[PDB]
Structure formats: C-alpha cells, structure tokens
Amino acid sequence: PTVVGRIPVLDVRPVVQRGRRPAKAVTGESFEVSATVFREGHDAVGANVVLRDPRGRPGPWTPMRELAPGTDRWGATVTAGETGTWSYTVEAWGDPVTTWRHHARIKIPAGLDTDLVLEEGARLYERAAADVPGREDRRELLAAVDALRDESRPAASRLAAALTPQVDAVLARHPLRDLVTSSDPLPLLVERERALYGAWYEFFPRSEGTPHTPHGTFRTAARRLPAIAAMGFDVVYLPPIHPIGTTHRKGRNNTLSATGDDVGVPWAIGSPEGGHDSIHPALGTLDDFDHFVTEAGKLGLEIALDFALQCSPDHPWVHKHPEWFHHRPDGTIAHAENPPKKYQDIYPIAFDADPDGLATETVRILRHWMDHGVRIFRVANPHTKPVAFWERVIADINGTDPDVIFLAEAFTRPAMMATLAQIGFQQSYTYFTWRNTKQELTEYLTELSGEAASYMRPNFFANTPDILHAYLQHGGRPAFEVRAVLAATLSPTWGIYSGYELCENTPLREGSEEYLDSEKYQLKPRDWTRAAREGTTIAPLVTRLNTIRRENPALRQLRDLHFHPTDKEEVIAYSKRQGSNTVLVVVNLDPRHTQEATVSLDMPQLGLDWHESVPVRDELTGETYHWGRANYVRLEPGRTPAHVCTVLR
Amino acid sequence: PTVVGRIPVLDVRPVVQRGRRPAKAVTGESFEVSATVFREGHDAVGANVVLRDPRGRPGPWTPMRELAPGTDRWGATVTAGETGTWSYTVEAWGDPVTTWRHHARIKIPAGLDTDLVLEEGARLYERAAADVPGREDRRELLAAVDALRDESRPAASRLAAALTPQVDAVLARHPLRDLVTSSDPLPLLVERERALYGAWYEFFPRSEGTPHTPHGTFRTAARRLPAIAAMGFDVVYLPPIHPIGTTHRKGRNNTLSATGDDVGVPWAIGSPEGGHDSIHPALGTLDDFDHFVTEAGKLGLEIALDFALQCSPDHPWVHKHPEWFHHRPDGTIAHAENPPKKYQDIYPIAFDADPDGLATETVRILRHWMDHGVRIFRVANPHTKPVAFWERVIADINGTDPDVIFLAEAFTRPAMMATLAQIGFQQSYTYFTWRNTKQELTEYLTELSGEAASYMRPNFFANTPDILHAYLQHGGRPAFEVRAVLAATLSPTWGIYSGYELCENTPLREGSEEYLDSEKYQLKPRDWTRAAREGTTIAPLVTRLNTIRRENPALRQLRDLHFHPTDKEEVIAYSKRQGSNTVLVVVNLDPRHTQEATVSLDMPQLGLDWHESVPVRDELTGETYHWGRANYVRLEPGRTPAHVCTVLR
Numbered sequence A, B: 001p002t003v004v005g006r007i008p009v010l011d012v013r014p015v016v017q018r019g020r021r022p023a024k025a026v027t028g029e030s031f032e033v034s035a036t037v038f039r040e041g042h043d044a045v046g047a048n049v050v051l052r053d054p055r056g057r058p059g060p061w062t063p064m065r066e067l068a069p070g071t072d073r074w075g076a077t078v079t080a081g082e083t084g085t086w087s088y089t090v091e092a093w094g095d096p097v098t099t100w101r102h103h104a105r106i107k108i109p110a111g112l113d114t115d116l117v118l119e120e121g122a123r124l125y126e127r128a129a130a131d132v133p134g135r136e137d138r139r140e141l142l143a144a145v146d147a148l149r150d151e152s153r154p155a156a157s158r159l160a161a162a163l164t165p166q167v168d169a170v171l172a173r174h175p176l177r178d179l180v181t182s183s184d185p186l187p188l189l190v191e192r193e194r195a196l197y198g199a200w201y202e203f204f205p206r207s208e209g210t211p212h213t214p215h216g217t218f219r220t221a222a223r224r225l226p227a228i229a230a231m232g233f234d235v236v237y238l239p240p241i242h243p244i245g246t247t248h249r250k251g252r253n254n255t256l257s258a259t260g261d262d263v264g265v266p267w268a269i270g271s272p273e274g275g276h277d278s279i280h281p282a283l284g285t286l287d288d289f290d291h292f293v294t295e296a297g298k299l300g301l302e303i304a305l306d307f308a309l310q311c312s313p314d315h316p317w318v319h320k321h322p323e324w325f326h327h328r329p330d331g332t333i334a335h336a337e338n339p340p341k342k343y344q345d346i347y348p349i350a351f352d353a354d355p356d357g358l359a360t361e362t363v364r365i366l367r368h369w370m371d372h373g374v375r376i377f378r379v380a381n382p383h384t385k386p387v388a389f390w391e392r393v394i395a396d397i398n399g400t401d402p403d404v405i406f407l408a409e410a411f412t413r414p415a416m417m418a419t420l421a422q423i424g425f426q427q428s429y430t431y432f433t434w435r436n437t438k439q440e441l442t443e444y445l446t447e448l449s450g451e452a453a454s455y456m457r458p459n460f461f462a463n464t465p466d467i468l469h470a471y472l473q474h475g476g477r478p479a480f481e482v483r484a485v486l487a488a489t490l491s492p493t494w495g496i497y498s499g500y501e502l503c504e505n506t507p508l509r510e511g512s513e514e515y516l517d518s519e520k521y522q523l524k525p526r527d528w529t530r531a532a533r534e535g536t537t538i539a540p541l542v543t544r545l546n547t548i549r550r551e552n553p554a555l556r557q558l559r560d561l562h563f564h565p566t567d568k569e570e571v572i573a574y575s576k577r578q579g580s581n582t583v584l585v586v587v588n589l590d591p592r593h594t595q596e597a598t599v600s601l602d603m604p605q606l607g608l609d610w611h612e613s614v615p616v617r618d619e620l621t622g623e624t625y626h627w628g629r630a631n632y633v634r635l636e637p638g639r640t641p642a643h644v645c646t647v648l649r
C-alpha cells in the first residue's frame, strides 16, 4: 500500500496532536476544513468535505475551493450539529469537465480539431449524466450531449450549448469526479453552545449577608441572583463553598495570622466539618444549596463551582490519605507557593504515590456536585497538577456526562495552556488582562481566533479576585467601560468578578495587581441599592453588552474576526460576521483623553465594494450612521468609550 | 491510556507526513531532534534523545537543552551512522537534582532549614548512586552523601561537597531521572554519503565525436572523462542513451521537422531499434557502455542515467501496450505539452488502465541498468506521472538495492516538489537558478537548510540544457563565476551542464531561457583544448571549488548555515560549520561593477566572542587575513568574484 493515494490529499486541518485528540466545535459553529490537494500533470482537480455525525451519517455536499492562487491549499466551511463525536474526511478528485472546458474555449475559436474536441466533451457529459439521480437533471445533460454531437451546427454554438447556466448548475450539484481519493478520517468533538458562548459573573456568597447576619448564606445570596440575571449573565461562578481550615488561616490583606472573627480564604479547603464534598456551615446546608441552584435555574443562570485540588492542614485527607502529600524528612508538609507568593494556609497534593485513589476520589466529588445541578467547573491552577491526571479525569466525567464543562485557570507559559485545552479542558483563561494596547490586543486575538480556536475556547475575564490591572487602577471608570466592551465583543465568553461594576480599583500597593482589602480574606458587603440609585455602577453598560450579544450571532462565535486600520495608536477597530449579521466595533483605548481618528474599513472583508456606503446603528446609543471606505470618529472618555455597530439589512 | 504521559513530551521533530514517512539523513550527517518538554509545577525537567539503529541498539547518552528561554522547546544534535532504517525517541523526566541545587544554593547561605535541605539532597544522591553501573562513580556519589549527612561540619561545606566538578561529571553522565516518559518512536531513513554530497557534470556523449565520425560513441566520449574527473566531479549525468524516434522528430533550434542529418532529441525515446532497455546504435553497444562505466569507475565517477517515462511514436510500447496511452475518440494520442511549450516528438504515458504492468516494466528497466553499474537515476518530469507511482517504484528498488539514488527533475509548485521528496526521492532539483538577488538566496536557502532538510536534498545545477538564466546572459564570465561559487558553497550537491565552463550564454532570443543552437537538437562539438590553452574556461575555478569542498567537511553538509549582514545590497555573506571546520563566504552578486562593503560577522555564531579577531585563508588565492566583528571587502568582477575562507585552527 502507498501512503499517498491516486489524487494527493495531504496535511488536512484542523488537526490536534497528529489526530490523537479531537479538534473542537460547538453545536451551530462554522469553521474551515482545509487540505493540500493537487495532481500530476496540468489537468484540474476538485475536492469536498465529508463530515460524519456520531451515527456515521454524511453531511450535505460541501465542495472546496483553492484558497489562494498557486498554493494548492483548498478549503471549505462546515457547521457542526448535534453534540457528540463526529469525523471529517477530505475527498479529492480529477475534475475532467473543468479541464475540458478550459481547452475547448481555446480550441473551438482557433479552429483546432473541433469535431474531436466536441466529441470528447460529449463523452464526459454522458458519463456525468449517468450518475445523476434526478430525471430532469439527466435530460438537461443529455440535450447538451446531442447539441455537442450535432455536426450540422457551427462549432461555437455546439460548444455554447454545453456551457449554459442550467448545465453549470447540474454539474455543480452532481459533478463528474475522477479517481476519487480520500484522507483518513479525523475526529471532531462537538459540545454544547455554552462551552463557547456565555457571559459569566463571579461572586462570593458569604459577602451577601444582612445587618444582623454579616456572613451570607445560600438563602441570602440567592437574592443577588435577580440582579445578576438582569445584567444578562448566563453563568454564576462561585469560589469554593466548602468548610475553611483554621491552622495557618490567613487574616485581612493577606496577613499571616487570623484574629477571632476573620473568615479566612475559601481556597484553604477543609476542616473536621468536612472536605470538598461539604458545605461551609455558615453558608447553610446542602438543601440551602439546592434552593440556590433552583433559583438560579429559574432565572437562566447555571452554577459553576470552583474545584481546587489542594487542602488546608485540617482537611480530613491529611490523616486519612497521607500518601496524597509530599512529606519532608521530618514529616512536615511544605505549604504551597507560586513564587514569590506563599500560600501558608494550604498544602499541595502529590500524585505519584496513589494516582488511582486520587482520580477515583476526584470524580466522586465532581459527580456529587453534578448530582446537585452543577454542570460547570472552574478548575484552579490545573497546571500544578499532572496534565495526564486532568486528561483521565475529564474523560471519565465526559464519558458519562458529556455536557459538563471544565474551565482551566492556567495563567502560565503557552505550551502548558495549549496542552491543557487539547487534553480536554472546554474553556481556558487567557492573557487578556495583560493585553491592553492596540498592538497587544490585535496580535493576541489574531492568535486566539486563528489556529488555536480548533482546540481552545477563551473566557475573557476583565478582572478576577487576583487581577486588578494597572490599566484599571490608573484609568478609573472609563477604563472599566473600555475593557467591558473589548471583552464582550472580542470573545463569545467573557466575565467579570463582582465589584468590577463599581469600578473598585484601589490596589494593595503601587505596583501590585491585588485589590486592597481583598474579598479573599474578608467579608465585603457592597451596597448595591445605593450604587444603582447614585449611578456609580456600569451595570447598565454591562446589561447592554449582553443584550447586544444575545441579539447578534456574530458576537456568539470566535473564529470570524478582522481588524481594520485607523490612523491613531489609541484607536482600534474590528468586525465580526455570522450569516448576514455583521458587527463593527471601534474603541478608544485612551481612558483620559478624547481621541479622533479616521477608520478605514477593509470593505471586501464585509462583502462590499470600495465605493459602497452602508447604514449602521451604534447599539450603545440607538444612533445611526452611513459608513464606508473612510469614516471619522470622535470618542470622549466617560461619555462614549466606543461604537458597537450592527450593519443594517 | 492517556495521550500525554507523566512528563509531557510533545510535537517531536523532525517529522514527515505525521510519522507515516521517514525523515532523512546520510551516514555521518548531524541534525537536531527537538521536542516540547515541560511539567506541572515549578520543578526542573530534563530530556534526552534515544537514537536506535536498524538492529535496535541505542546510541550514546544524548542530553537536550532548552533552545530559547520560556519556550519549553528542547533539542540536541544526533549523528547518523550505518545506512538503513533507524528510529528516534525523546525521553523527558523530572530533574530533581537541578531543582534541589537551585534551592540549596539559596537556603544554606540564608540559614533556612539547613539540616532538612541537606538530608533531602543526601537522599537524592543515594538514589542517583543506585542506578550508576560503575563502582568508582558509585563511591564518589556515596562520599558526597556522607559529607552532606555529616552534622559536625558547617552547612556551606556539607553543601560544597555535593557541588564538586567530580560529582557534576558523574551526574551529567548518569543523571537521576524521575518519571521517565517517552515519545512514540519516529522513523529515520539513513542513506549513503552521495545522496547529500557530490558534484555533478552533465554532458551529451554524442557531441564528443571525431572529424570522420561527428556522432560520438561511448568509446569516443570516454575520453572526456579524465577532464571531468580532473575538475573534481563525482557523478556524470548522461541524457537518454536510447534509440531516438523518427516520427515528428525535431530539427535544430526546436523546429518542427528534421532534415536528413538531424539527430533529434534524446528525450524522444524509442524506435524499432529498441526502447528504454536499449542503446542508440550510433553510441555503440551494451559492451561499449560497460567500458564507459568501467572507465568512469576507475576515475571516481559514478554514472547517472536519465530516466524519462514517455515515448516517441515509434517506441515499441505504442503497439505492444496501447493501454499505456490515452487515446482520443479517433485513435490518436495527443503529444505531450508543458504550456505554452509543445513536445510534438513524444507521447505521455497514461497510468489508469494498467498500473501494475507499468510498474513491473519500470522496475525491470531500472534493474537492467543497475545490473550494468548504474546506481543513480535522474528522473525527468516526475510530476507528470502519479506521485504514488513513484512511491511504489522507489520502494521496490530501494527494498532490494537501498544504495540507489533517484533525483527528481520537478520544476513545479512547492507542494508537489516537497511531496516527491517525502515519498522517496533522494534528491531534488530546486528553484536555485531563479534565485539571484541577495534577498532571494537568503530566503530560499533559509527554507532549504531549515525544516525542509529533513525530507529534501537539493542538487544545485547552476545551469541545465533548458535553463540559461538572464543573470548569465547579461553577466558574462563574472556571472558564471559567481553562480559557481554560490552553488558549490551553499549546497553539498551542485552541478553544471557542459559548456558552463566556457561561459556559453547566447540565448535563443531575448526573453528566453533556452540556449541558441541547443545541444538538445544538434551535435555540439566544443574545442576544449583551445579553451584550456587560451584561458577562456572557468574549469580551474571549478576544479578549485571541488577541492575546497573535498577539504572542508563544513561544505559537505546542508543544515548548518548562517547569513551575516553586510551594508550593501549586492554583497552577501555566510558561514557553514561541521566540527572544527568553519567556512566563511563573501560574494559580490554584481557581475558588472566593483562593490565594497563592510561585512559584520555574528561572532557568537562562529563560537567566538565579539571582541575576538580570527585568522582566515581565502582558499581561492591562498591569501590570509585577520577578521572579526567588522571587515572591509572590495570585490572586483572578473578578478575576484568572492572570498571563500577557512577559519584557521
């Protein structure tokens, strides 16, 4: 057998790990399958994509086109359907009809061998007609055969009878394919909408208490949910909800020792009250949780729980399973670190003594929360646990419950971030918060919307409890507004951590990315009613952004994204498309000064001519413009952070 | 099972066709194996390459290094040995000793936990010692263990006893490796020296005749061989040596019809006198050929025969095997084309009616010429025959005779050129002749010396009978000299076609790459003796270039090549290395005007520091310089086309 077939079809993409891991999509998402296709000699080739579903049923006829002249790289767009495991194949073939037309168009006018050329075409059309299942299509090809063979007519009109638009259309639907050759199938894992598209809100239930009871419960925190759903969020991400340890518990502003009332860090999981399968007694009981999950469901909110595979020193695992920790010659366990940061309140897990036991327990815990309506997990620091451990765990859970989504909080080097996505993590945290200039965003989003999108789905949190970027510290409210627009229009999944709306931006000290009086070490009651009444919240903007996203399919997908040039470093512009929905975004990245620029739109990139003008509506104002080729803009920080425009049809 | 192992080792290179075809090397050639290697957490990893020979025996210990900071891309150099099919594996592992030293160097001086740190190191060294096969090595590690555990000594000296150069050397030879994880093997095909390295000379035996008998014979052409070997060539490439057809035979300067005496084109193979397994009667007999082959052997010349799978209309195959040709409805066979060029004297072969028969016959012919001492074939237009056909043929021949080398004359699109190399062609013609400016050469050679070198070996013919570039047409002798230096120093295989030495450069017409009065259509007697005596040949330069190549291993390999910047567009500079042999080349690409430039050498790239100055000898003159950082040069076309300098050791 030969590695290469009769008509070469090579280097099919997308491909992940040489075909050992699947490329990804979600229900409804379009993407390009591509291949290198060519043949020996000068004759024409064709190709097409055969997409098969989990039952093996092929998709509709999906022909490909050479993507740039002279490159022999062919592609076409496919669209994923029901969830599950699909496969794709590329088929390549000789296209003898195209070759024959090309030659005949030259040979009949020049008077060369005309009878032979027409008879050769007649034999092709006859072969084409034989494989056409429809009788009206068959009869149309046979009539062109008869006109081609009619020696009483002039050569040009015998030929013209074979090139009519009604013949073209039969052959584009049922083409004559020689030497059909096929690639080996490649796997595609299709998952639910929410893995690619959603808006997320993180908050600490314990902060939503009452005057008489400061430490919130699941019942009091349920009262925050209607405001969250009113902002247009779909997912609620809760930090760890388990009992919190006492030994080496941390105090306010990350001080080493807790005083009597200090609540500690939710990430220091475990006490004699319970471990990862327990509720912190001050949040209530498992019943109170179910109530919270039910109320979230009634508002269109799914719950995502933090899953942090680590322990406080009071966690039951420390004495029940000491082999799950690395012990020093004197028997002590070194606390975790992420230098120069120290986590004195926790122990890291070790995996090389009882990997089976740790995997079995890990999936038990996850299945417990899944039994209580949790179908999404934000996994903390997955990169400090073995990559293969996550590969095994995710495959175990998705094997019985494929709807479960895992999100990797891996802020680390690129190889590890990518590898985690490839081995199963449905979503990934990104470098978004450290991409703030026009050049940084453009470069980074070109990476994420390009080849990486076949294995990684980005979740753009504009802030987190550990990341308050200098851009926000220095920019105030206008900076918060900018980053919300950026995050919500560039990624189909974005998120904020509560307080973002109030433009909380006091850092722990100059040069740091921690918040002052961080919610991780203390209760942080916020007076939401006052903020709303006094207009010192950007919740309305946030609400608007999620409404825009819900109304424009272009913003519920990742791969289609183009950047358009502007004549000012502080102003960025880009567009996104999906069917006939096109969205155009212009942002002023300067939060202090008013910026004017000329935005020059790559018009072919919107399906338009250079001369053309098109009506747009800025969905942040309801105000309408007519834009083309070159458009002036003026963006005043605080009044208008940006235009977010739909193209009107 | 998991796709990723305990310590991730991913995307091993080189790789060809995802591991379905082998990467290539030759006996003695070094190249880099690389991989992406990292682990979870902050501790160190190590890696190494296990190269296995055809009997499965591993090579020596071959550790890798991170190739650039923060990239997690690791590599090392391996060197191929005996011919055959080898495999390579990358092993990755935790490097607990490096982690432990790093920490201990900080912790012992700061006074932190000193007894624990030293005891943790002692347990490592003990584990390391247990896998050391040599008793003296074991005893050296065990003495460091005892010094580390000696609580009576100061901490700094207990530590220093574990960091001595004699301990370092035991651990660099036998390191303690945790969680050893291995890639799946990848295949490597190693072939003989001559597949990568050699100098080639093409000439038409029929042109070397006598006053009384103008059409040369194998016996008269043998007399040209000593001059060829004196020029330092290793391979003689003969155009087709078979009978030539009469029907549609071409005349002089590619005219349609031949007159009585016209010899026709050797590529119009076949007549009633015989086909591809026959000798043209005017060249003599199969005995005369053996004599030629024997005389070539005695001078260190191997023969390479053209193999052109096509026919004149008078070839026996036309009536013996009509199914090997595509016939038009009226029974005629269309002549070959390569538009806008027509080859009216030949028919192309068709492969889809009797592919078995054609393959069987093709290898019969090749085995016939192999029986007569021909172990190299220059395959004409492989790209007009199916890629898989060549895959099958080459695998059949190399299965019994792995020493046979095939060279693809495929001047076509990149995908097909690459694919042919990948499916078995030992050598490839290249775009060399159309790369003439500094930017063209730099880009193109960066491609060829980079990733493509794991599947393609370039043969740089500076001219061919079908390519007389405009650079030569317009540049005269200085241009010939330039290209000879370029070709011979940039590729370990280069070649010329006879006449190049005389600076034959009259084109058929302005705008063409054909020669006037082309040797393809007529006998071309040349006065070699006069040219030698009158100094109007560059054979001496050619002779010198092959001698330089035979004396400097740096020029007998491809992959190690670096370009150094110059301050003039017309002047190019580069270097090549192989062990202690470094060769440095500066070329003036202007054949009309004298050029001066400052060449600034990337000194770290020669294994030298910036301050250093280094003696060099220009091997085209025997003249000596001292060069560093910045060096002035003056190149006068005709007197000095270039410096070709060895670095003196």
Ligand SMILES: O=P(O)(O)O[C@H]1O[C@H](CO)[C@@H](O[C@H]2O[C@H](CO)[C@@H](O)[C@H](O)[C@H]2O)[C@H](O)[C@H]1O
Pocket: A250, A254, A265, A266, A267, A268, A269, A308, A310, A338, A342, A343, A344, A345, A346, A380, A381, A409, A465, A466, A520
């Ligand atoms: O920067 P990272 O190490 O990724 O931070 C992430 O993981 C840590 C550890 O769980 C979290 O750090 C918080 O929790 C620690 C343990 O309870 C505590 O010691 C730290 O001071 C506190 O920052 C972090 O929130 C998480 O996202």
Ligand SMILES: O=P(O)(O)O[C@H]1O[C@H](CO)[C@@H](O[C@H]2O[C@H](CO)[C@@H](O)[C@H](O)[C@H]2O)[C@H](O)[C@H]1O
Pocket: B250, B254, B265, B266, B267, B268, B308, B338, B342, B343, B344, B345, B346, B380, B381, B409, B411, B465, B466, B520
């Ligand atoms: O352009 P290419 O086809 O790659 O050139 C190579 O193959 C052709 C076909 O054989 C050769 O062209 C010569 O031979 C033809 C057959 O006799 C003749 O008809 C043409 O006039 C002649 O140029 C070429 O030498 C070869 O290397």
